[PDB]
Design a protein around this ligand. Sequence first.
Ligand SMILES: CN(C(=O)N[C@@H]1COCC1(F)F)[C@H]1CCCOc2c[n+]([C@@H]3O[C@H](COP(=O)(O)OP(=O)(O)OC[C@H]4O[C@@H](n5cnc6c(N)ncnc65)[C@H](O)[C@@H]4O)[C@@H](O)[C@H]3O)ccc21
Ligand SMILES: CN(C(=O)N[C@@H]1COCC1(F)F)[C@H]1CCCOc2c[n+]([C@@H]3O[C@H](COP(=O)(O)OP(=O)(O)OC[C@H]4O[C@@H](n5cnc6c(N)ncnc65)[C@H](O)[C@@H]4O)[C@@H](O)[C@H]3O)ccc21
Lengths: 140, 140
Amino acid sequence: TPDVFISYRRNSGSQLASLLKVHLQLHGFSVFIDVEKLEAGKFEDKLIQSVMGARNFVLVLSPGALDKCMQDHDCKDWVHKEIVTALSCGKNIVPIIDGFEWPEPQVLPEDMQAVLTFNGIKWSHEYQEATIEKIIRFLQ
Amino acid sequence: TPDVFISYRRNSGSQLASLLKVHLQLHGFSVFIDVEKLEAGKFEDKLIQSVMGARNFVLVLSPGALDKCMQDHDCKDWVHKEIVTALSCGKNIVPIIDGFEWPEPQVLPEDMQAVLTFNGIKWSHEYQEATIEKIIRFLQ
Ligand SMILES: CN(C(=O)N[C@@H]1COCC1(F)F)[C@H]1CCCOc2c[n+]([C@@H]3O[C@H](COP(=O)(O)OP(=O)(O)OC[C@H]4O[C@@H](n5cnc6c(N)ncnc65)[C@H](O)[C@@H]4O)[C@@H](O)[C@H]3O)ccc21
Ligand SMILES: CN(C(=O)N[C@@H]1COCC1(F)F)[C@H]1CCCOc2c[n+]([C@@H]3O[C@H](COP(=O)(O)OP(=O)(O)OC[C@H]4O[C@@H](n5cnc6c(N)ncnc65)[C@H](O)[C@@H]4O)[C@@H](O)[C@H]3O)ccc21
């Protein structure tokens, strides 16, 4: 059981997600990110179960990262599925803000609007060590 | 005198440049990147001095990273300035390709066209440890 699950958008947050993984691992956290820990089998069940296993849900909110979730009421988008799983399970959700614009709740499907109520951490390129140290304070 | 200077475009390569910085330090290299090592003074002189001082010049080629170099014949663009300094000083240039597309050399100012003749490393999101090991192989 990894302690932290990192959810991110491939096209805009892959580098920040990877950087969070390295830092969190250096500070002793077991981290789940797909490219390191998603292995053999049907990936839908493996991903969802890996969200369920992690106490902490770190959400990389790069620019436009929730765009594909909009109008995704069938829950086909994978960031959407991961967020809903995290919310449903009562995870400690820690959004990471990297140029993300806060949207109106009503543009997001009802089952994920609650993600916007969690206190988010601004990623600071100029003060990255301080950002990392704050993220660690948020983890459990 | 850091062993490695990391040159990058803020608007598209900040995260990968920081990720490279962390990994290279973890493997024992002294690294210069502006957000960690550029301190007080006239920044033009300090940056140029820092490029001249570093044996290895790691160039983060994010998508469109050399675009603002194009037709910058007064050498006002800062990536352009760092590249010309590295070329002029005969540094070990190691381009890192992250979705960057190789241009026709003549689109670049004549004083930096040679950057394309250096063997570049592909950044692989799925094989990051292998990418980092290759980068370290390339460094002196
Ligand atoms: C198992 N996967 C993998 O990628 N497996 C990779 C190999 O082993 C580990 C690995 F994850 F890196 C894919 C499976 C397809 C669903 O997408 C995800 C999503 N996520 C989680 O969602 C967030 C990212 O969502 P996202 O930015 O919207 O992604 P896209 O931009 O649509 O990328 C998806 C890319 O998968 C390609 N592809 C389609 N079929 C398969 C398949 N059978 N098998 C492999 N790829 C497939 C497709 O063509 C596209 O290019 C994150 O939070 C993340 O946890 C993890 C893994 C996958
Ligand atoms: C000292 N600097 C800093 O940034 N200093 C920062 C504070 O201490 C360390 C620090 F570097 F983070 C700036 C100075 C301005 C020139 O640009 C660079 C470039 N680089 C090297 O070039 C590559 C990045 O080139 P690039 O993606 O095109 O850049 P942009 O970000 O598009 O533009 C620059 C941004 O600097 C803002 N800004 C303008 N005035 C100043 C000033 N006095 N003082 C601070 N900022 C200024 C401006 O408004 C804009 O936003 C890389 O390879 C890099 O080595 C390093 C530092 C600076």
